[PDB]
């Protein structure tokens, strides 16, 4: 079972040239609890964004090019990424856009944070045909002194 986890602003924006213009420590906490002790598949750009391996997660990095960090596992295809996660209850695909697009059709679950932020971005979460997905969990939060925007955690399971 493959799951995607992603934080989307409006128009499904997940990435832009520069850092996201927001501060959303609850979504980071959500990301950590939903990925904890699970293999994480990411693209090389996301790997570079994160800086270091996510602790206590098997980290699997897609690149067409040889790896450049022996702390993590490097694979050259989607199927190699999955195989590299081994035999686990849940693989988390943590992005970015190229990676999500390739994994969404394979995924049984989505963990999406919907952030009420107006951002122009070059990278977007894939369209998930909502007839293919059932929302099983939805939890809205206003912005607050720690979180710059309102946001909603959603879990969807593939029909
Ligand atoms: N011209 C464009 O508009 C364009 C197109 C694509 C990306 N970008 C830029 O990249 C940034 C973020 O991109 P993102 O979030 O899409 O990155 P991402 O998915 O985290 O990382 C993408 C990288 O992951 C690797 N990858 C993904 N799928 C793979 C596969 N099946 N096999 C082998 N390697 C695979 C490739 O690394 P290697 O690069 O090492 O092969 C690829 O370049 C954005 O700022 C965006 O503008 C721009
Ligand atoms: N809900 C959600 N929120 C996100 O911020 C998110 N980010 C990505 C990809 N980018 C990143 C960037 C940094 C870290 C990261 O370093 N997380 C730490 C928390 C500590 C910190 O921010 O320095 C972690 O251990 O999980 C993770 C993913 C993928 N899915 C997401 N999904």
CATH of the domain at 3: 3.40.430.10
Please indicate whether residue 75, judged by its CB atom, sits closer than 6 Å to ligand 2: no
CA of 31 to the centre of ligand 2 (A): 6
d(CA 151, CA 125): 16
In which domain, by residue range, is 111 found?
1-159
Chain centroid offset of residue 44 CA: 13
H helix intervals, 44-155: 44-50, 78-84, 97-103
| φ and ψ at residue 74, rounded to 5 degrees | -115, 135
Method: X-ray
What separation in Å is there between the alpha carbon of 98 and the centre of ligand 2? 17
Q: What are phi and psi of 46, to 5 degrees?
A: -70, -40
What is the 142 CA–ligand 1 centroid distance (Å)? 32
Residue nearest to atom 14 of ligand 2 (CA): 50
| Residue 142 and residue 26 in contact, taking contact as beta carbons nearer than 8 Å | no
**CA 85 to centroid of chain Cα atoms:** 16
Q: Which atom of ligand 2 is nearest to the CA of 35?
A: 26
Residues 74-98: b if buried by 16+ CB within 10 A, e if exposed: bbeebeebbebbeeeeebbbbbbbe
Domain count, the chain: 1
- Mutation test residue for ligand 2: of 12, 28, 103, the one with most atoms within 8 Å of CB: 28
């Amino acid at each position: 079972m493959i799951s995607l986890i992603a934080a989307l602003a409006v128009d499904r924006v997940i990435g832009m040239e520069n850092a996201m213009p927001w501060n959303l420590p609850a979504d980071l906490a959500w990301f950590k609890r939903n990925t904890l002790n699970k293999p994480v598949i990411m693209g090389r750009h996301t790997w570079e964004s994160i800086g270091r391996p996510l602790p206590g997660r098997k980290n699997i990095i897609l690149s067409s090019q040889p790896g450049t960090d022996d702390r993590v596992t490097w694979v050259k295809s989607v199927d190699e990424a999955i195989a590299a996660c081994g035999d686990v209850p849940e693989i988390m695909v943590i992005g970015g856009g190229r990676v999500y697009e390739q994994f969404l059709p394979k995924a049984q679950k989505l963990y999406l944070t919907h952030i009420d932020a107006e951002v122009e971005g070059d990278t977007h979460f894939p369209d998930y045909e909502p007839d293919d997905w059932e929302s099983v969990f939805s939890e809205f939060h206003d912005a607050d002194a720690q979180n710059s925007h309102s946001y909603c955690f959603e879990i969807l399971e593939r029909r």
